[PDB]
Amino acid sequence: FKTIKSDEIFAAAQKLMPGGVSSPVRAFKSVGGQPIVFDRVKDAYAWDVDGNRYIDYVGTWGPAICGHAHPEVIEALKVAMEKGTSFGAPCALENVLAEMVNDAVPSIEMVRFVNSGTEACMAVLRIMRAYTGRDKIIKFEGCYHGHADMANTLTTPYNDLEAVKALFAENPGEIAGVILEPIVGNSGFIVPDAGFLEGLREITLEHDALLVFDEVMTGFRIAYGGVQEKFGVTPDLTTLGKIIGGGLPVGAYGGKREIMQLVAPAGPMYQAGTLSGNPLAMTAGIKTLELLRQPGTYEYLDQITKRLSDGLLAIAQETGHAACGGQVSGMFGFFFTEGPVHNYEDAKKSDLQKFSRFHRGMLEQGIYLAPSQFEAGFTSLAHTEEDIDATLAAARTVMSAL
Amino acid sequence: FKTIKSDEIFAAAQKLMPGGVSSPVRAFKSVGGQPIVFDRVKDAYAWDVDGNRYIDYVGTWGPAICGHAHPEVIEALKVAMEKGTSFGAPCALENVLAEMVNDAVPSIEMVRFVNSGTEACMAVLRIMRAYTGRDKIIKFEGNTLTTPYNDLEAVKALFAENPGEIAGVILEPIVGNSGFIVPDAGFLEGLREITLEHDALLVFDEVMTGFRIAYGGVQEKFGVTPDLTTLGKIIGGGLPVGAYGGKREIMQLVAPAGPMYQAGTLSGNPLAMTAGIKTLELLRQPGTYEYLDQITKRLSDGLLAIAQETGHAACGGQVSGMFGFFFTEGPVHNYEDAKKSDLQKFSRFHRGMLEQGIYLAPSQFEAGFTSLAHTEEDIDATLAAARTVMSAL
């Protein structure tokens, strides 16, 4: 297992960019220290600059749900770019993607496209405060909503309704609303307990506060309508990203019409994006959603991912390793702790030392997993039953050691 | 001049998105409210959904400096996308662009790529505070302290009023967001001196000026080096991109190198890097910036000469392929002056130009842009249209 070229490229990168990456997690410092430089990706695979091929479970963090470089998405992009890469003015593609999104997400009646999950969460934090006239916002420890700066931020344990109620009591008429990942993926994979989302919906309504779902990662993955549709709980606002861009930089935030009306130039809340509604980004997103509309899509994702997760758990047992995990559609998690995992605190009980060795072993078996214990794993419509079998055979080999 | 399809599309848009647009300025509010919907762009032109062709002076706000849909940029993108549109991991292209950006910009010794000018400025404001340990920042009109652009005395005053509290000063070395406004002689130098004097950072927002005013931007053009600068647009070839860099030791604070957290799941996108690398290479060809200054100087002068002959009060100016034209006698030194402009006249002017086949920024407070694709004839035709429109008004 050679990674010479990656080391060469990474070494050079450290003198050009901070830590030699465009995003901190890529630096592998939490699972080793020596990341692998990608050359190309296709379907369920990615290839090293050294020629090593991997069965990918990162899917560039969520967008590649139809597989890397889907022929139809690429063909669509080829045609679209002949028309120019950016307009800086309105184009019909924006209407189409917006209409598709409104039809897909229960809470979305009006949308605004931006360029990243960060920009979307940033903008939604502002409509929240602008609309309610209140400044404090409630978020959960472990949840990630971009690197937007945000004393006005109250935090609480994920899956803790009583902690949420307490914050409202301690801050009467000061809570603009509650924002969260209806299903966590940024502190490992964590599903909401029975009644948690509903409860959040009940208390926010009770206090005229907004319920905001960050579905940047779960949107169009957990279900076409995302978690909100899947679990039948409708927020007032929700953010989107990744998948709706089909690989290109994209983001979006929308929800109830009367709230979105505050967004400029409709309303006073100023939010701008010079290259927003990018025609290439719109094209890939549209094609990606149409593909997701085909028959058996989500059934297939759940099918192969449930088998993956279970197998991973069965193998940990057989090999004598404590572990817990779970999966909903094509999103899963695997922790090295007996758990169960209900919040970030639990998740951190994981044997990070072991995960590190496990991650590297898997790498040597040609499997590419998220370089961190606190990241959900992803599957795609391109992953074959064989890819799942191969991933499990690899898991056994690696865990049989450890 | 029919705009039926644009009207239908924009009408439908308002029931789907806030104001029927992705960015406020596209709504044409300050110029009639009847935006035109683009279908495609090429070279120096843009085409309506109604089939109307325009000589474009917006260039999607700066990225199209080598022309719209340049054959070599598109070819490079086609070739790159066979390898995937996004990795979520390091790729060689990042090193290539990062290195080219370092070589090009005087103050940048280390860069971090992001996905927008917004993310970059957002990150730079954070390194400023993180690095100085101070919370207040000075910006210019047009924890936040503001002052009139081109007012060194107003800036000195803020420092005296907040001893040891100013992390630094951030600005567009050349203004384009409140109309085109050049820095008066000694201004940028002055800012450099006072920031240095108070151990405060000097930050240049060259998202719009970078690689346009000059390969090295305004900081290179005017010989004034900041400690940190943000980039965008052009380095992306049209695709969403952004970047911030500067002194090595300051950038070391950026995660994972340092404690200041800033992330971008899709940052360093291979398609954006490819298009950015190809655009910079094209700009490295012979006579590029001399060409931009040549046609843009003629355009601006003619625009001013025409206003004169038609009896309209106006002022403007241009540096490289960036210009401004205000309907006020000026001169314009700051936003306050810019606001004396006859917006009512501008609107009528902007529409009449649209009718003559010329697409200008739908706002008096936006700089104009030219590209290597604009030919002498396009400039001729633009001035000829300028006269027709201003002969009326």
PDB file of N, CA and C in Angstrom, chain A residues 9 13 16-18 21-24 26 37-41 60-61 74 78 81-83 85-88 90 94-95 110-112 116 119 122 144 147-149 242 247 265 271 273-274 276, chain B residues 9 13 16-18 21-24 26-27 38 40-41 60-61 74 78 81-83 85-88 90 94-95 110-112 116 119 122 126 233 237-238 256 261-265 267:
ATOM      1  N   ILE A   9       2.659  15.388  -2.462  1.00  0.00           N
ATOM      2  CA  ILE A   9       1.721  16.476  -2.713  1.00  0.00           C
ATOM      3  C   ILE A   9       1.293  17.152  -1.423  1.00  0.00           C
ATOM      4  N   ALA A  13       1.782  20.987  -0.142  1.00  0.00           N
ATOM      5  CA  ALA A  13       0.586  21.739   0.205  1.00  0.00           C
ATOM      6  C   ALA A  13       0.707  22.481   1.531  1.00  0.00           C
ATOM      7  N   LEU A  16       1.889  25.931   1.256  1.00  0.00           N
ATOM      8  CA  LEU A  16       1.058  26.799   0.410  1.00  0.00           C
ATOM      9  C   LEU A  16      -0.295  27.142   1.031  1.00  0.00           C
ATOM     10  N   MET A  17      -0.849  26.200   1.784  1.00  0.00           N
ATOM     11  CA  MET A  17      -2.146  26.396   2.410  1.00  0.00           C
ATOM     12  C   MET A  17      -2.072  25.993   3.883  1.00  0.00           C
ATOM     13  N   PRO A  18      -2.933  26.583   4.732  1.00  0.00           N
ATOM     14  CA  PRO A  18      -2.925  26.249   6.163  1.00  0.00           C
ATOM     15  C   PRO A  18      -3.158  24.756   6.403  1.00  0.00           C
ATOM     16  N   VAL A  21      -4.543  22.046   3.425  1.00  0.00           N
ATOM     17  CA  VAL A  21      -5.876  21.628   2.981  1.00  0.00           C
ATOM     18  C   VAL A  21      -6.814  22.838   2.859  1.00  0.00           C
ATOM     19  N   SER A  22      -7.978  22.625   2.250  1.00  0.00           N
ATOM     20  CA  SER A  22      -8.976  23.677   2.095  1.00  0.00           C
ATOM     21  C   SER A  22     -10.021  23.544   3.204  1.00  0.00           C
ATOM     22  N   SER A  23     -10.008  22.399   3.880  1.00  0.00           N
ATOM     23  CA  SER A  23     -10.913  22.146   4.996  1.00  0.00           C
ATOM     24  C   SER A  23     -10.165  21.301   6.041  1.00  0.00           C
ATOM     25  N   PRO A  24     -10.135  21.760   7.304  1.00  0.00           N
ATOM     26  CA  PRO A  24      -9.452  21.076   8.413  1.00  0.00           C
ATOM     27  C   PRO A  24      -9.533  19.541   8.485  1.00  0.00           C
ATOM     28  N   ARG A  26      -9.811  17.292   6.274  1.00  0.00           N
ATOM     29  CA  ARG A  26      -9.000  16.619   5.264  1.00  0.00           C
ATOM     30  C   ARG A  26      -7.574  16.293   5.711  1.00  0.00           C
ATOM     31  N   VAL A  37      -4.227  12.024  -1.366  1.00  0.00           N
ATOM     32  CA  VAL A  37      -4.615  12.974  -2.391  1.00  0.00           C
ATOM     33  C   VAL A  37      -5.378  12.232  -3.484  1.00  0.00           C
ATOM     34  N   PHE A  38      -6.609  12.660  -3.746  1.00  0.00           N
ATOM     35  CA  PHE A  38      -7.442  12.034  -4.773  1.00  0.00           C
ATOM     36  C   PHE A  38      -7.051  12.495  -6.169  1.00  0.00           C
ATOM     37  N   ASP A  39      -7.271  11.633  -7.155  1.00  0.00           N
ATOM     38  CA  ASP A  39      -6.988  11.993  -8.540  1.00  0.00           C
ATOM     39  C   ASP A  39      -8.306  12.017  -9.291  1.00  0.00           C
ATOM     40  N   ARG A  40      -9.136  11.002  -9.059  1.00  0.00           N
ATOM     41  CA  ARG A  40     -10.444  10.915  -9.710  1.00  0.00           C
ATOM     42  C   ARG A  40     -11.414  10.042  -8.919  1.00  0.00           C
ATOM     43  N   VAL A  41     -12.701  10.210  -9.204  1.00  0.00           N
ATOM     44  CA  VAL A  41     -13.747   9.455  -8.539  1.00  0.00           C
ATOM     45  C   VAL A  41     -14.786   9.036  -9.566  1.00  0.00           C
ATOM     46  N   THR A  60     -17.780  12.573  -1.194  1.00  0.00           N
ATOM     47  CA  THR A  60     -17.441  13.987  -1.114  1.00  0.00           C
ATOM     48  C   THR A  60     -18.367  14.700  -0.127  1.00  0.00           C
ATOM     49  N   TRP A  61     -18.701  13.969   0.934  1.00  0.00           N
ATOM     50  CA  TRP A  61     -19.540  14.439   2.031  1.00  0.00           C
ATOM     51  C   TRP A  61     -21.032  14.601   1.791  1.00  0.00           C
ATOM     52  N   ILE A  74     -22.995  14.504 -15.660  1.00  0.00           N
ATOM     53  CA  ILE A  74     -21.866  15.029 -16.412  1.00  0.00           C
ATOM     54  C   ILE A  74     -22.293  15.473 -17.815  1.00  0.00           C
ATOM     55  N   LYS A  78     -21.947  19.141 -19.351  1.00  0.00           N
ATOM     56  CA  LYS A  78     -21.244  19.389 -20.607  1.00  0.00           C
ATOM     57  C   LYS A  78     -22.071  20.320 -21.486  1.00  0.00           C
ATOM     58  N   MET A  81     -22.505  24.102 -19.861  1.00  0.00           N
ATOM     59  CA  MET A  81     -21.370  25.017 -19.864  1.00  0.00           C
ATOM     60  C   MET A  81     -21.056  25.672 -21.194  1.00  0.00           C
ATOM     61  N   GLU A  82     -21.610  25.130 -22.272  1.00  0.00           N
ATOM     62  CA  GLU A  82     -21.403  25.700 -23.589  1.00  0.00           C
ATOM     63  C   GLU A  82     -22.145  27.028 -23.597  1.00  0.00           C
ATOM     64  N   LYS A  83     -23.104  27.157 -22.684  1.00  0.00           N
ATOM     65  CA  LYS A  83     -23.897  28.372 -22.579  1.00  0.00           C
ATOM     66  C   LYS A  83     -23.265  29.390 -21.638  1.00  0.00           C
ATOM     67  N   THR A  85     -20.505  29.622 -17.901  1.00  0.00           N
ATOM     68  CA  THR A  85     -20.450  29.114 -16.538  1.00  0.00           C
ATOM     69  C   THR A  85     -21.176  29.945 -15.493  1.00  0.00           C
ATOM     70  N   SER A  86     -21.377  31.230 -15.767  1.00  0.00           N
ATOM     71  CA  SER A  86     -22.036  32.109 -14.795  1.00  0.00           C
ATOM     72  C   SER A  86     -22.676  33.304 -15.507  1.00  0.00           C
ATOM     73  N   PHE A  87     -23.860  33.714 -15.058  1.00  0.00           N
ATOM     74  CA  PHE A  87     -24.567  34.828 -15.678  1.00  0.00           C
ATOM     75  C   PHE A  87     -24.604  36.096 -14.831  1.00  0.00           C
ATOM     76  N   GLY A  88     -24.832  35.947 -13.532  1.00  0.00           N
ATOM     77  CA  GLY A  88     -24.913  37.112 -12.670  1.00  0.00           C
ATOM     78  C   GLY A  88     -26.255  37.796 -12.885  1.00  0.00           C
ATOM     79  N   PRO A  90     -30.740  36.558 -13.689  1.00  0.00           N
ATOM     80  CA  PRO A  90     -31.665  35.427 -13.590  1.00  0.00           C
ATOM     81  C   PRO A  90     -31.593  34.519 -14.821  1.00  0.00           C
ATOM     82  N   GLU A  94     -33.007  28.483 -12.474  1.00  0.00           N
ATOM     83  CA  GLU A  94     -33.288  28.818 -11.084  1.00  0.00           C
ATOM     84  C   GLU A  94     -34.743  28.558 -10.722  1.00  0.00           C
ATOM     85  N   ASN A  95     -35.646  28.829 -11.657  1.00  0.00           N
ATOM     86  CA  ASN A  95     -37.065  28.611 -11.425  1.00  0.00           C
ATOM     87  C   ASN A  95     -37.345  27.124 -11.286  1.00  0.00           C
ATOM     88  N   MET A 110     -40.986  28.864  -0.213  1.00  0.00           N
ATOM     89  CA  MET A 110     -40.205  29.855  -0.948  1.00  0.00           C
ATOM     90  C   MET A 110     -38.736  29.615  -0.617  1.00  0.00           C
ATOM     91  N   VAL A 111     -37.873  29.611  -1.636  1.00  0.00           N
ATOM     92  CA  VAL A 111     -36.435  29.372  -1.443  1.00  0.00           C
ATOM     93  C   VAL A 111     -35.508  30.450  -2.001  1.00  0.00           C
ATOM     94  N   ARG A 112     -34.309  30.499  -1.433  1.00  0.00           N
ATOM     95  CA  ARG A 112     -33.261  31.417  -1.852  1.00  0.00           C
ATOM     96  C   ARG A 112     -31.999  30.570  -1.986  1.00  0.00           C
ATOM     97  N   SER A 116     -23.200  27.752  -0.373  1.00  0.00           N
ATOM     98  CA  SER A 116     -22.704  26.738   0.560  1.00  0.00           C
ATOM     99  C   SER A 116     -23.653  26.517   1.730  1.00  0.00           C
ATOM    100  N   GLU A 119     -23.305  29.460   4.112  1.00  0.00           N
ATOM    101  CA  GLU A 119     -24.048  30.664   3.771  1.00  0.00           C
ATOM    102  C   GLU A 119     -25.532  30.511   4.080  1.00  0.00           C
ATOM    103  N   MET A 122     -26.002  30.603   7.778  1.00  0.00           N
ATOM    104  CA  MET A 122     -25.720  31.978   8.176  1.00  0.00           C
ATOM    105  C   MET A 122     -26.951  32.852   7.917  1.00  0.00           C
ATOM    106  N   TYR A 144     -23.303  20.883  13.777  1.00  0.00           N
ATOM    107  CA  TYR A 144     -22.499  21.792  12.980  1.00  0.00           C
ATOM    108  C   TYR A 144     -23.369  22.461  11.927  1.00  0.00           C
ATOM    109  N   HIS A 147     -19.347  27.639   9.546  1.00  0.00           N
ATOM    110  CA  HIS A 147     -18.463  28.346  10.462  1.00  0.00           C
ATOM    111  C   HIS A 147     -18.874  29.792  10.721  1.00  0.00           C
ATOM    112  N   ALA A 148     -20.172  30.074  10.647  1.00  0.00           N
ATOM    113  CA  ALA A 148     -20.645  31.429  10.907  1.00  0.00           C
ATOM    114  C   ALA A 148     -20.372  31.743  12.376  1.00  0.00           C
ATOM    115  N   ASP A 149     -19.712  32.871  12.628  1.00  0.00           N
ATOM    116  CA  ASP A 149     -19.376  33.302  13.986  1.00  0.00           C
ATOM    117  C   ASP A 149     -20.273  32.738  15.083  1.00  0.00           C
ATOM    118  N   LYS A 242     -25.244  20.608  -0.631  1.00  0.00           N
ATOM    119  CA  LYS A 242     -24.669  19.393  -1.184  1.00  0.00           C
ATOM    120  C   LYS A 242     -25.432  18.769  -2.342  1.00  0.00           C
ATOM    121  N   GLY A 247     -22.604  18.163  -6.802  1.00  0.00           N
ATOM    122  CA  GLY A 247     -21.156  18.226  -6.876  1.00  0.00           C
ATOM    123  C   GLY A 247     -20.594  19.635  -6.863  1.00  0.00           C
ATOM    124  N   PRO A 265     -34.680  41.023  -2.331  1.00  0.00           N
ATOM    125  CA  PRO A 265     -35.271  42.362  -2.325  1.00  0.00           C
ATOM    126  C   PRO A 265     -36.756  42.375  -1.964  1.00  0.00           C
ATOM    127  N   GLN A 271     -29.248  39.843   2.140  1.00  0.00           N
ATOM    128  CA  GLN A 271     -28.416  38.673   1.916  1.00  0.00           C
ATOM    129  C   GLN A 271     -28.136  38.660   0.422  1.00  0.00           C
ATOM    130  N   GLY A 273     -25.557  37.206  -2.985  1.00  0.00           N
ATOM    131  CA  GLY A 273     -24.715  36.143  -3.495  1.00  0.00           C
ATOM    132  C   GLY A 273     -24.511  36.418  -4.969  1.00  0.00           C
ATOM    133  N   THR A 274     -23.392  37.063  -5.281  1.00  0.00           N
ATOM    134  CA  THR A 274     -23.034  37.437  -6.640  1.00  0.00           C
ATOM    135  C   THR A 274     -23.099  36.287  -7.643  1.00  0.00           C
ATOM    136  N   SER A 276     -24.629  33.345  -6.974  1.00  0.00           N
ATOM    137  CA  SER A 276     -25.698  32.442  -6.555  1.00  0.00           C
ATOM    138  C   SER A 276     -26.610  32.072  -7.719  1.00  0.00           C
TER     139      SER A 276
ATOM    140  N   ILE B   9     -41.062  34.584 -17.082  1.00  0.00           N
ATOM    141  CA  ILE B   9     -40.157  33.878 -16.187  1.00  0.00           C
ATOM    142  C   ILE B   9     -39.950  34.606 -14.865  1.00  0.00           C
ATOM    143  N   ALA B  13     -41.011  33.571 -11.099  1.00  0.00           N
ATOM    144  CA  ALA B  13     -39.929  33.545 -10.122  1.00  0.00           C
ATOM    145  C   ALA B  13     -40.301  34.133  -8.757  1.00  0.00           C
ATOM    146  N   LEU B  16     -41.673  31.832  -6.180  1.00  0.00           N
ATOM    147  CA  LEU B  16     -40.779  30.736  -5.828  1.00  0.00           C
ATOM    148  C   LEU B  16     -39.606  31.171  -4.951  1.00  0.00           C
ATOM    149  N   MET B  17     -39.069  32.355  -5.229  1.00  0.00           N
ATOM    150  CA  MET B  17     -37.928  32.868  -4.495  1.00  0.00           C
ATOM    151  C   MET B  17     -38.157  34.316  -4.071  1.00  0.00           C
ATOM    152  N   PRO B  18     -37.532  34.736  -2.956  1.00  0.00           N
ATOM    153  CA  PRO B  18     -37.665  36.103  -2.436  1.00  0.00           C
ATOM    154  C   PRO B  18     -37.320  37.149  -3.487  1.00  0.00           C
ATOM    155  N   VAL B  21     -35.474  36.344  -7.226  1.00  0.00           N
ATOM    156  CA  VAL B  21     -34.047  36.324  -7.566  1.00  0.00           C
ATOM    157  C   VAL B  21     -33.176  35.643  -6.507  1.00  0.00           C
ATOM    158  N   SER B  22     -31.921  35.368  -6.873  1.00  0.00           N
ATOM    159  CA  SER B  22     -30.952  34.733  -5.972  1.00  0.00           C
ATOM    160  C   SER B  22     -30.076  35.785  -5.304  1.00  0.00           C
ATOM    161  N   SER B  23     -30.095  36.999  -5.842  1.00  0.00           N
ATOM    162  CA  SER B  23     -29.320  38.103  -5.290  1.00  0.00           C
ATOM    163  C   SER B  23     -30.153  39.358  -5.554  1.00  0.00           C
ATOM    164  N   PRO B  24     -30.413  40.156  -4.504  1.00  0.00           N
ATOM    165  CA  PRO B  24     -31.207  41.391  -4.563  1.00  0.00           C
ATOM    166  C   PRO B  24     -31.033  42.287  -5.795  1.00  0.00           C
ATOM    167  N   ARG B  26     -30.312  41.722  -8.753  1.00  0.00           N
ATOM    168  CA  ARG B  26     -30.866  41.192  -9.996  1.00  0.00           C
ATOM    169  C   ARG B  26     -32.325  41.556 -10.204  1.00  0.00           C
ATOM    170  N   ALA B  27     -32.983  42.056  -9.158  1.00  0.00           N
ATOM    171  CA  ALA B  27     -34.399  42.419  -9.247  1.00  0.00           C
ATOM    172  C   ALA B  27     -34.664  43.712 -10.013  1.00  0.00           C
ATOM    173  N   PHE B  38     -31.370  35.912 -18.619  1.00  0.00           N
ATOM    174  CA  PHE B  38     -30.340  35.433 -19.542  1.00  0.00           C
ATOM    175  C   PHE B  38     -30.551  33.976 -19.926  1.00  0.00           C
ATOM    176  N   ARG B  40     -27.920  32.534 -22.299  1.00  0.00           N
ATOM    177  CA  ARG B  40     -26.538  32.134 -22.536  1.00  0.00           C
ATOM    178  C   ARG B  40     -25.660  33.360 -22.739  1.00  0.00           C
ATOM    179  N   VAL B  41     -24.362  33.192 -22.503  1.00  0.00           N
ATOM    180  CA  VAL B  41     -23.395  34.266 -22.688  1.00  0.00           C
ATOM    181  C   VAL B  41     -22.199  33.724 -23.447  1.00  0.00           C
ATOM    182  N   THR B  60     -20.765  38.890 -15.564  1.00  0.00           N
ATOM    183  CA  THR B  60     -21.191  38.163 -14.373  1.00  0.00           C
ATOM    184  C   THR B  60     -20.495  38.692 -13.128  1.00  0.00           C
ATOM    185  N   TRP B  61     -20.295  40.004 -13.129  1.00  0.00           N
ATOM    186  CA  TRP B  61     -19.680  40.735 -12.031  1.00  0.00           C
ATOM    187  C   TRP B  61     -18.181  40.547 -11.815  1.00  0.00           C
ATOM    188  N   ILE B  74     -13.714  26.333 -21.035  1.00  0.00           N
ATOM    189  CA  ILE B  74     -14.734  25.297 -21.163  1.00  0.00           C
ATOM    190  C   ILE B  74     -14.110  23.946 -21.497  1.00  0.00           C
ATOM    191  N   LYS B  78     -14.481  20.579 -19.390  1.00  0.00           N
ATOM    192  CA  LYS B  78     -15.001  19.325 -19.937  1.00  0.00           C
ATOM    193  C   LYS B  78     -14.059  18.185 -19.595  1.00  0.00           C
ATOM    194  N   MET B  81     -14.124  17.389 -15.658  1.00  0.00           N
ATOM    195  CA  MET B  81     -15.297  16.729 -15.101  1.00  0.00           C
ATOM    196  C   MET B  81     -15.422  15.230 -15.342  1.00  0.00           C
ATOM    197  N   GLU B  82     -14.614  14.683 -16.246  1.00  0.00           N
ATOM    198  CA  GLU B  82     -14.657  13.250 -16.481  1.00  0.00           C
ATOM    199  C   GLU B  82     -14.077  12.598 -15.226  1.00  0.00           C
ATOM    200  N   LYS B  83     -13.294  13.368 -14.472  1.00  0.00           N
ATOM    201  CA  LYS B  83     -12.671  12.869 -13.245  1.00  0.00           C
ATOM    202  C   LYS B  83     -13.510  13.090 -11.991  1.00  0.00           C
ATOM    203  N   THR B  85     -16.803  15.842 -10.266  1.00  0.00           N
ATOM    204  CA  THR B  85     -17.012  17.264 -10.038  1.00  0.00           C
ATOM    205  C   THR B  85     -16.554  17.728  -8.663  1.00  0.00           C
ATOM    206  N   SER B  86     -16.424  16.787  -7.731  1.00  0.00           N
ATOM    207  CA  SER B  86     -16.035  17.121  -6.369  1.00  0.00           C
ATOM    208  C   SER B  86     -15.407  15.909  -5.668  1.00  0.00           C
ATOM    209  N   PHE B  87     -14.378  16.157  -4.859  1.00  0.00           N
ATOM    210  CA  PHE B  87     -13.679  15.081  -4.157  1.00  0.00           C
ATOM    211  C   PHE B  87     -13.911  15.045  -2.657  1.00  0.00           C
ATOM    212  N   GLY B  88     -13.856  16.212  -2.025  1.00  0.00           N
ATOM    213  CA  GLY B  88     -14.032  16.271  -0.585  1.00  0.00           C
ATOM    214  C   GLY B  88     -12.721  15.872   0.064  1.00  0.00           C
ATOM    215  N   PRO B  90      -8.043  16.346  -0.653  1.00  0.00           N
ATOM    216  CA  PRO B  90      -7.012  17.091  -1.376  1.00  0.00           C
ATOM    217  C   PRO B  90      -6.786  16.567  -2.787  1.00  0.00           C
ATOM    218  N   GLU B  94      -5.398  22.051  -6.353  1.00  0.00           N
ATOM    219  CA  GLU B  94      -5.361  23.036  -5.268  1.00  0.00           C
ATOM    220  C   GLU B  94      -3.957  23.636  -5.129  1.00  0.00           C
ATOM    221  N   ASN B  95      -2.943  22.777  -5.106  1.00  0.00           N
ATOM    222  CA  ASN B  95      -1.558  23.238  -5.005  1.00  0.00           C
ATOM    223  C   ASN B  95      -1.205  24.167  -6.166  1.00  0.00           C
ATOM    224  N   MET B 110       0.499  32.492   1.776  1.00  0.00           N
ATOM    225  CA  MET B 110      -0.243  31.280   2.110  1.00  0.00           C
ATOM    226  C   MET B 110      -1.727  31.557   1.891  1.00  0.00           C
ATOM    227  N   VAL B 111      -2.403  30.658   1.171  1.00  0.00           N
ATOM    228  CA  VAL B 111      -3.829  30.807   0.849  1.00  0.00           C
ATOM    229  C   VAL B 111      -4.702  29.650   1.320  1.00  0.00           C
ATOM    230  N   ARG B 112      -5.967  29.971   1.551  1.00  0.00           N
ATOM    231  CA  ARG B 112      -6.978  29.012   1.953  1.00  0.00           C
ATOM    232  C   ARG B 112      -8.135  29.315   1.018  1.00  0.00           C
ATOM    233  N   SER B 116     -16.851  31.497  -1.664  1.00  0.00           N
ATOM    234  CA  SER B 116     -17.440  32.782  -2.010  1.00  0.00           C
ATOM    235  C   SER B 116     -16.647  33.938  -1.417  1.00  0.00           C
ATOM    236  N   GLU B 119     -17.575  34.146   2.234  1.00  0.00           N
ATOM    237  CA  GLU B 119     -16.910  33.262   3.186  1.00  0.00           C
ATOM    238  C   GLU B 119     -15.499  33.762   3.464  1.00  0.00           C
ATOM    239  N   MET B 122     -15.544  36.810   5.611  1.00  0.00           N
ATOM    240  CA  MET B 122     -16.032  36.324   6.891  1.00  0.00           C
ATOM    241  C   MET B 122     -14.877  35.671   7.659  1.00  0.00           C
ATOM    242  N   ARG B 126     -12.286  37.248  10.934  1.00  0.00           N
ATOM    243  CA  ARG B 126     -11.997  36.401  12.081  1.00  0.00           C
ATOM    244  C   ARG B 126     -10.506  36.252  12.367  1.00  0.00           C
ATOM    245  N   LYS B 233     -14.134  35.509  -7.557  1.00  0.00           N
ATOM    246  CA  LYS B 233     -14.527  35.696  -8.945  1.00  0.00           C
ATOM    247  C   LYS B 233     -13.571  35.089  -9.967  1.00  0.00           C
ATOM    248  N   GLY B 237     -13.072  31.267 -12.501  1.00  0.00           N
ATOM    249  CA  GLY B 237     -13.480  31.087 -13.888  1.00  0.00           C
ATOM    250  C   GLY B 237     -14.982  31.050 -14.096  1.00  0.00           C
ATOM    251  N   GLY B 238     -15.736  31.613 -13.159  1.00  0.00           N
ATOM    252  CA  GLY B 238     -17.185  31.601 -13.293  1.00  0.00           C
ATOM    253  C   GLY B 238     -17.855  30.747 -12.231  1.00  0.00           C
ATOM    254  N   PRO B 256      -6.393  23.409   9.813  1.00  0.00           N
ATOM    255  CA  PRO B 256      -5.911  22.684  10.993  1.00  0.00           C
ATOM    256  C   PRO B 256      -4.528  23.133  11.457  1.00  0.00           C
ATOM    257  N   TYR B 261     -11.072  28.250  13.667  1.00  0.00           N
ATOM    258  CA  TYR B 261     -11.825  27.315  12.836  1.00  0.00           C
ATOM    259  C   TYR B 261     -12.599  27.916  11.672  1.00  0.00           C
ATOM    260  N   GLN B 262     -12.353  27.357  10.494  1.00  0.00           N
ATOM    261  CA  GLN B 262     -13.015  27.761   9.261  1.00  0.00           C
ATOM    262  C   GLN B 262     -12.977  26.532   8.367  1.00  0.00           C
ATOM    263  N   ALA B 263     -14.144  26.098   7.905  1.00  0.00           N
ATOM    264  CA  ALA B 263     -14.200  24.919   7.055  1.00  0.00           C
ATOM    265  C   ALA B 263     -15.057  25.129   5.814  1.00  0.00           C
ATOM    266  N   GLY B 264     -14.840  24.264   4.829  1.00  0.00           N
ATOM    267  CA  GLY B 264     -15.582  24.332   3.590  1.00  0.00           C
ATOM    268  C   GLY B 264     -15.601  22.946   2.988  1.00  0.00           C
ATOM    269  N   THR B 265     -16.729  22.266   3.148  1.00  0.00           N
ATOM    270  CA  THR B 265     -16.893  20.909   2.648  1.00  0.00           C
ATOM    271  C   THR B 265     -16.552  20.782   1.163  1.00  0.00           C
ATOM    272  N   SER B 267     -14.909  23.249  -0.597  1.00  0.00           N
ATOM    273  CA  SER B 267     -13.820  24.166  -0.915  1.00  0.00           C
ATOM    274  C   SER B 267     -12.729  23.423  -1.671  1.00  0.00           C
TER     275      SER B 267
END
